[PDB]
């Protein structure tokens, strides 16, 4: 009834409203949302049994379960929920990347079971954002520090199935089953996280000792390690459905990526399978489209641009980018075909992919110049449009497609800047505005198809690969089912 894993760090304090990336897995073990995301893109009842919205889409009224207790035995009710929203909104700035935190105007408990949330605008993807691991999940208000969470908490008391019982710093965290959980309790009663900061040391600890499984993204489970494990029949390995897309964003307003033919050429010139086999140790899927077809609203049958250097070269040639005698880089009006790829210098994987991409483009006569900078400078370039090409990712999980599309129409964002050279940019932005505000599902799919097709046809992006969540486990443990939000390891499905 017990399992052991490993993690690079202790996760305390596990504040639901100041969650760090290394805490995001633990967050979901302890803290729960009003509504629960499903693979089909919808949300279903969870702590809220049901909900209604006003006709203008700005008032949302949630009817809550009446049988839920925080793990310390205090009731979950509308007042406790409203207190959490207040605590989050008191720190509104820290959450401004999440449109919901910007959208909420008022939260009011109408009764013990009725929670009303008022938004600035119709924003129907509201529900998908409530389903995120953070920040709109619930800690017992008794555990606030002086009536806030932004300045810290007391005990990490959620409604969830697991309780963080003990830490021994730099040694282990221990989660135990909440015996008073409102829902489906795990068969497992204890999960111990040995704190093993070095990923090679973690991997050896799995191979040798009584650690039952490891899981995570690239930062937690190195891609080369996972490839090795996936080869070895002594271990079980699994890869989730696609989460994020990794791509280049091409600046449609800056020469030479202002030319459709150049962007199309770039899309045909990258050998994605080889890049993945090499830099990513064959662990990810090739991305032909901005969103994987498993992404809600994105199963569009868009035409892939398959790796074809001959076609890439023909596109450049027709566009006037030709090789002079005795030269290996194309020129047009005496100007070489040069494209800057700016990336975060300290990011090893970005650097590895940039080098591969540079080499691919040499084969078609294009000079990709690599510029590694501080993250702070790359951030400013993205806001400003001071880039030729940049690495970029979607968010996956329940935020996409809506969140990623929403930012395309807002100034000071990479995707807005990248798209400035498109003749249909105003139509795209209007349609994104409409898709976010539409209550009609038919109109929603028609609009998503139009926006994504336009962006695909105009070759704004150079999709490279889809990132999956990795799990490696001892054979005796069993397969673990993936959850709709891949970080939410479904520990209740583990059967002793
Ligand atoms: Ni409705």
Swiss-Prot record:
GO terms for molecular function: heme binding; metal cluster binding; nickel cation binding; peptide transmembrane transporter activity; transition metal ion binding. The gene is nikA. Keywords: Nickel, Periplasm, Signal, Transport. This is Nickel-binding periplasmic protein. InterPro entries: CntA-like, Peptide/Ni-bd, SBP_5, SBP_5_CS, SBP_5_dom. It holds the Pfam family SBP_bac_5. PROSITE patterns: SBP_BACTERIAL_5. Its main location: periplasm. One of its GO terms (cellular component) is membrane. Belongs to the bacterial solute-binding protein 5 family. It is found in: Periplasm. Involved in a nickel transport system, probably represents the nickel binder. GO terms for biological process: negative chemotaxis; nickel cation import across plasma membrane; nickel cation transport; peptide transport.
């Amino acid at each position: 009834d017990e399992i052991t894993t490993a993690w690079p760090v202790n996760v305390g304090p596990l504040n639901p409203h100041l969650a760090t990336p290394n805490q995001m897995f633990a967050q979901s073990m302890v803290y729960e949302p009003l509504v629960k995301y499903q693979a089909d893109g919808s949300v279903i009842p969870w702590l809220a049994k049901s909900w209604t919205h006003s006709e203008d889409g700005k008032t949302w009224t949630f009817t809550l379960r009446d049988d839920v207790k925080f793990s310390n035995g205090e009731p979950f009710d509308a007042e406790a929920a409203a207190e959490n929203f207040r605590a989050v909104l008191d720190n509104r700035q820290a959450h401004a990347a999440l449109e919901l935190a910007n959208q909420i105007v008022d939260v009011k408990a109408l009764s013990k079971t009725e929670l009303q949330i008022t938004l600035k605008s119709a924003y129907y993807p509201f529900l998908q954002e409530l389903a995120l691991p953070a920040p709109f999940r619930f800690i017992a208000p008794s555990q606030f520090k002086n009536h806030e969470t932004m300045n810290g908490i007391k005990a990490p008391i959620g409604t969830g199935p697991w309780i963080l019982q003990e830490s021994k710093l730099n040694q282990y965290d221990v989660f135990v089953r909440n015996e008073n959980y409102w829902g489906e309790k795990p068969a497992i009663k204890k999960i111990t996280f040995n704190v093993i900061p070095d990923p090679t040391t973690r991997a050896v600890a799995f191979e040798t000792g009584d650690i039952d499984l490891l899981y995570g993204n690239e930062g937690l489970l190195p891609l080369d390690t996972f490839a090795r494990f996936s080869q070895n029949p002594a271990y079980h390995t699994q890869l989730s459905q696609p989460i994020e897309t990794v791509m280049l964003a091409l600046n449609t307003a800056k020469a030479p990526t202002n030319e459709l033919a150049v962007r199309e050429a770039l899309n045909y010139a990258v050998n994605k399978k080889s890049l993945i086999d090499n830099a990513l140790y064959g662990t990810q899927q090739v991305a032909d489209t901005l969103f994987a077809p498993s992404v809600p609203y994105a199963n569009l049958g868009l035409k892939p641009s398959q790796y074809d250097p001959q076609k890439a070269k023909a596109l450049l040639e027709k566009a006037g980018w030709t090789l002079p005698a005795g030269k290996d880089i194309r020129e047009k009006n005496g100007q070489p075909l040069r494209i800057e790829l700016s990336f975060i210098g300290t990011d090893a994987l970005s650097k590895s992919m940039a080098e591969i991409i540079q080499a691919d483009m040499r084969q078609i006569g294009a000079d990709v110049s690599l510029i590694g900078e501080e993250e702070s400078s790359i951030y400013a370039r993205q806001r400003d449009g001071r880039f030729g090409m940049i690495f970029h990712r979607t968010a996956g999980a329940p935020a996409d497609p809506h969140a990623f599309l929403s930012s395309m129409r807002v100034p000071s964002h990479a995707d807005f800047q990248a798209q400035q050279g498109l003749a249909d940019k105003p139509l795209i932005d209007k349609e994104i505005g409409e898709v976010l505000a539409t209550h009609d599902e038919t109109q929603r799919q028609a609009l998503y198809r139009d926006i994504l097709t336009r962006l695909h046809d105009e070759a704004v992006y150079l999709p490279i690969s889809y990132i999956s969540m990795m799990v490696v486990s001892k054979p005796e443990l069993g397969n673990i089912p993936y959850a709709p939000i891949a970080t939410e390891i479904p520990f209740e499905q583990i059967k002793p």
